Point group: D2
Chain length 120, copies 4
């Protein structure tokens, strides 16, 4: 139920393929009408989840460099896919920027994102 | 400088290859070195970091399923590589386990790992 | 304003008073976990926030010991109060349990709670 | 003896002086290595005053809002962690620093990190 297009609550979209070997591969678009706002993602998911009501654990990374832009940073999302008629991917994320050592204390933001199969 | 064998502070073993386009691939886990303890990882890194002394942002995921065990969970590490005399990767991580909706509040552990090219 | 009774998305009850000196005091009752009736909280908030439409930063702690139960753990909530037609406190939290050194890597849970003055029960 | 009352130093110079009350309160101040009044802020928190006896640490947490009589950063840090006793006593923490932001900037409101405190520097 993971392969396809997902939308967060803030205007981002990604398309992912959940491969038979546990791979997640796809593209994350940070801004809707922008073609220079697309980035590679890559991650892993549990390809044999429990069928007991529990979500399917997964995670992925986007390094915020493409052919057009580079923020010198990367986000990782860690979360779980929850199926059903209102399917969701519920995540928490860490965004680390490259810094000098003196700035390392402020290198990492934390937050949370919920993705749905239908636009907000 | 990222490609290589790294060890965290607890002795976990991170064997990674960084490709020219931003891909990370490799295997994660073990001090025991047994086959039941090794897992696929994939991730991303900034392939054109700043030239001002800042580190190189990266992240990767392991889903904790292999041919031997399945913990129904996934860890993502978000961090930066710091070159120089003693290379290091400093990270923070999120470990999400699949849960029911009622237990989702306790699904995610957080911590920090530092990796070097020598065993602890 | 921050002073009042708030509820998170799970129905936990946060009764707080914001003092003129930046202090938060009050009680917390959890909808989840190894917890029963009210626990003491204390924290701090920015008593002179920016005037540009930003929220008001704050944080508080509950140690999960009262006269009835002790879970040997503590949650801290870090967040901001956002004035609006529907005022909200948006937080991230860290729950640390006391552990042995061997188990310290799994000592800390992380999550996010949103509080409103209206209960979403 | 809880072992927590006193002065602690993190790995980056900062100092705090805390009192651990018999009732689970933490009260004190957080300051820089320099120690000037302008670098000193109130803190408040809670700790488990009856920790387990199996070798586990003592859970605790505290908050500093970064406003004092001199300066205001419109932000607050919470530290969540555990005290570990012995000759080399430590407090191992993870922290969340939330800044007041507009809603448009709320996605970047919160930094995360970790701090280890010891009794010597």
């Amino acid at each position: 139920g993971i392969t396809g297009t997902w939308y967060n609550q803030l205007g981002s979209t990604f398309i992912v393929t959940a491969g038979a070997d546990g791979a997640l591969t796809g593209t994350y678009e940070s801004a809707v009408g922008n073609a220079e706002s697309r980035y590679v993602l890559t991650g892993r998911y549990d390809s044999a989840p429990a069928t007991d009501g529990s979500g399917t654990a997964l995670g992925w990374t986007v390094a915020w460099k493409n052919n057009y832009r580079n923020a010198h940073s990367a986000t990782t999302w860690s979360g779980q896919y929850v199926g059903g008629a209102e399917a969701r991917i519920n995540t928490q994320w860490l965004l680390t920027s490259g810094t000098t050592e003196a700035n390392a204390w402020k290198s990492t933001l934390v937050g949370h994102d919920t993705f749905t199969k239908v636009k907000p």
